[PDB]
Structures are given as structure tokens and as C-alpha cells.
Amino acid sequence: TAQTKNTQTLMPLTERVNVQADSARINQIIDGCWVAVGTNKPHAIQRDFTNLFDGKPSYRFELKTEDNTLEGYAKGETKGRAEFSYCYATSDDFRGLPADVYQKAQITKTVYHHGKGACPQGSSRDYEFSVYIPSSLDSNVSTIFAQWHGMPDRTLVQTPQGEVKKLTVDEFVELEKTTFFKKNVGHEKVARLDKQGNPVKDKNGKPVYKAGKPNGWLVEQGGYPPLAFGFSGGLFYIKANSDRKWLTDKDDRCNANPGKTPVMKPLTSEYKASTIAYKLPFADFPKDCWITFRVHIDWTVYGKEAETIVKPGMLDVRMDYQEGKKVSKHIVDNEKILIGRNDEDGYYFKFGIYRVGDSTVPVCYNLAGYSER
Ligand SMILES: [Ca+2]
């Protein structure tokens, strides 16, 4: 290859923030309102000066076949991620607080709870964003391009004796000194030891540990997104999830498959629901043009420790695009639906690529034009 690459049309954006565990620095924030999460390969996220949305650069996301960097549920499964998050904290957000507050928020993974861009429990919000799906996108991709997640606080725990309780941050910080967490499961924290019997340290002198046996503690971590827009099995779909349990049970994998679950017939467990609100065959999803989605969500209201449904939620979605003339398809019409999570804290938006279902089919598309109110 002898042609010098044109690097004017695309600009890699490679800064990444673990929003639960770290504040975003000013020079990591994109357009004053986003931070990026996931793989930092230069091609993963780029500002696109050629495909403009409303006259301004859009965002091109790409995962190649080899770009799954995350472990999936079952052994042998991987997932890939390159997303923007609308919710993150900055240094400014901790102004006025004691010196140790930020470090304890890092340990409890509650940093972004101090930042902008979240919607509280039981509230209502309108969201709008646009997507551009290239005609080259494989119809068998398995990817989520917009999703709204909950924000559980892992200081809600279950003790080894089975009590669900809220630890103070200081209590959780003490527990973390003795417990190694693998996702939501506590394990005895054991120091790795070198051949002389001394604690192992990495090249920088940080003590290294590993998980011993499970120690009975569980923490509220992870969970399905309450709302996701994606492609799977040759379908565009919109999926809403609900969990009314106070401490989510991670072994309850209530997740509707759009190829198996009829539209608006919820898959339910004792505490969870997963509903496919809309499906469209892949070939019918417009290509090589900007599609604007307008989404209204009334989040389900849950009864906290009572685990009740206090008020159902509601989802409304319109899909607008050029058809010569602007048309607006009312793809989800004011549907009463269970949508949300029974947590103290609320919900935040991401868009980009979250490649799921143990897929390595390449994904590439553009996103732009986000707003919420
Ligand atoms: Ca919860």
C-alpha cells in the first residue's frame, strides 16, 4: 500500500473514562457533553467530517472482528464495546466535599452518581438522537446502538447470613480491604505471594491479590439495560426490561430474544420482565441516511424494599427519516410497559456499539444529534 492515508476526514477519539470509578478530566470530554467507554483502538470511535449531521461532524463507531475485549456470560463468550456516555462526573463535581469523598466514591464505584446526565427514579424524560446505518452493515450483526442503563450502588449488599442491607461508604471501604469482588460476588481476598513467601507487587509496587473462596457477600452490580435499541437475528428491535427486586438477583437472566419472543408479550420471571416493544426486518430499516428517533419514557415506579409496582411505566417512540419528504413513523405508540430497575438511583443514556450474543460480525455506523429534557 503506497497511498498515504487521508487523515482529514476522520479523527480518532481515544480517551476512555471508567465512569463508575473515575472522574473525567476536561481533556477527555467530547463536545462538552460526552465521555467514551470501551476499547481505545483508534478506529473504534472517530469524529467524521464527511458525514455531517445538521451541518456538523458526526460520530463513526467501528468494531472489527477482532475487537471484542470483554468477557461474556458463558465461558468462551466475548463482547465488544465502544460507546459514549452522557453521564459522568468531573473534578468540579466534588468541589466543597471532604478530601476522602472522591476516593471513597472510586472504591464504591459511585463516581458518576455525582455527575450530570442521569434521570431520577420514577421520573419522565424525552430523548432524541439520530443514527446512520451504512448499506454495508451485515444483516446478521448483533449489536445495541442506544441504551439506557440503571445506576445501582453496590453498597447495597447481602450479608453471608442473607440480610439485605445498605452499608455506609466507610463500611464498604472496610469490606473491600478483606474481600475480592468478582462482579457481584465476594471472595476472600488473598495476597499473591512470590517464591520467597512475600506479597507480590506489580512493576510499580502495587500489592497484587486474587480471589479465594466465595465469602458469602453479594453486592448490587451490573444488570440488563432497562431500554435498548439494537439489531439481532436479522431484526431491528427495541427491548424494555424491568426488575422489581430490591437487590437484583443476577442468576435470573430474564432477557427476551427478539427472534423467539413475540412483540409486546413480556417474558417474565418472579421479579423481572423483558418486553420486545417493536421489531422491523433488517432490510426494511432505511440505509445510508439519517434516522432520528424521538423517545419518551415514563420510568416505572417501584416500592423500594416493598418490591411493589407503584406505577407502571410508559414508552413512546417515533422514527423519522426522509422518504423526498420527512415522514414520522409511530413505531411504539404510548405503550404501558414495565421499564426500569428498583434502585435508589436513576438512569443514563449511551450510544455507540455494544456487540452482544457472542458475535464477532464487524459493526460500523454513525450516530449524532443527541438531546434530552
Ligand atoms: Ca436494586
Q: Contact at 8 Å (CB) between 81 and 70? A: yes
CA 164 to chain centre: 25
From ligand 1's centre to the CA of 20, what distance in Å?
A: 16
Angstrom distance (rounded) from CA 284 to CA 136: 14
Dihedral pair phi/psi, residue 6, rounded to 5° = -75, 120
From ligand 1's centre to the CA of 271, what distance in Å?
A: 11
User: Containing H/E element for 41?
Assistant: none
What would the DSSP string read from start to end of 307-359? --EEE-EEEEEEEEEE---EEEEEEEEEEEE--EE-SSS-EEEEEEEEE-SS-
From ligand 1's centre to the CA of 121, what distance in Å?
A: 11
Name the H helices within the chain: 100-108, 169-176
Q: Contact at 8 Å (CB) between 149 and 299? A: no
Cα distance between the two ends of the chain? 48
Amino acid at 135: S
Dihedral pair phi/psi, residue 100, rounded to 5° = -85, -5
Residues 6+ apart with CB under 8 A from 32: none
- 3-state DSSP assignment of residue 283: helix
Which residue in the block uniquely carries the three cell numbers 426500569?
340
Angstrom distance (rounded) from CA 95 to CA 99: 10
3-state helix, strand, coil in the chain (%, to 5): 10, 45, 45
343 is in an annotated binding site: yes
**89 beta partners:** none
6 is in an annotated binding site: no
Residues 6+ apart with CB under 8 A from 216: 159, 160, 161, 186
Amino acid at 99: A
153 is in an annotated binding site: yes
**320 beta partners:** 292, 328
User: Containing H/E element for 370?
Assistant: strand 363-372
User: Containing H/E element for 117?
Assistant: none
Which residue in the block uniquely carries the three cell numbers 470530554?
29
Distances 312 to 111, 240, 244, 286, 339 between C-alpha atoms, Å: 30, 13, 11, 32, 8
From ligand 1's centre to the CA of 305, what distance in Å?
A: 9
Q: Give, in words, the CATH class of 1-152+223-373.
A: mainly beta
Residues 6+ apart with CB under 8 A from 303: 244, 309, 310, 342
Task: Report which DSSP code applies to 8.
Answer: S
77 is in an annotated binding site: no
Residues 6+ apart with CB under 8 A from 60: 10, 45, 46, 47, 48, 51, 364, 365, 366
What is 153-222's CATH number?
A: 3.10.540.20
Residues 6+ apart with CB under 8 A from 45: 12, 13, 14, 36, 59, 60, 61, 62, 82, 84, 352
Residues 6+ apart with CB under 8 A from 163: none
Q: Give domain limits for the chain.
A: 1-152+223-373, 153-222
Angstrom distance (rounded) from CA 13 to CA 42: 7
Q: Contact at 8 Å (CB) between 246 and 273? A: no
Q: Contact at 8 Å (CB) between 340 and 302? A: yes
Task: Report which DSSP code applies to 113.
Answer: G
Distances 223 to 108, 151, 154, 170 between C-alpha atoms, Å: 17, 9, 12, 25
| 1-152+223-373 matches 153-222 in fold | no
Angstrom distance (rounded) from CA 52 to CA 366: 10
Angstrom distance (rounded) from CA 276 to CA 294: 18
Q: Contact at 8 Å (CB) between 337 and 277? A: yes
User: What would you measure as the largest C-alpha separation in the chain, in angstroms?
Assistant: 75
The C-alpha cell that represents 294 in the structure block: 424521538
Task: Report which DSSP code applies to 305.
Answer: G
**45 beta partners:** 61
The C-alpha cell that represents 299 in the structure block: 420510568
From ligand 1's centre to the CA of 223, what distance in Å?
A: 10
Residue from 366, 367, 361 nearest 141 by CA: 361
Number of Cβ within 10 Å of residue 339's Cβ equals 25
Residue from 159, 154, 218, 162 nearest 186 by CA: 218
246 is in an annotated binding site: yes
Residue from 232, 58, 65 nearest 144 by CA: 232
From ligand 1's centre to the CA of 151, what distance in Å?
A: 9
Kindly give the pairing relationship between strand 164-166 and strand 227-232: unpaired
Please tell me what resolution, in angstroms, this structure has.
1.3
Amino acid at 290: W
Question: Ligand 1 (ion): which residues have CB within 5 A?
Answer: 342-343
The C-alpha cell that represents 355 in the structure block: 456487540
Q: What angle do CA 38, 44, 45 make, to 5 degrees?
A: 95
Sign of CA dihedral 98, 103, 109, 112: positive
Angstrom distance (rounded) from CA 198 to CA 245: 44
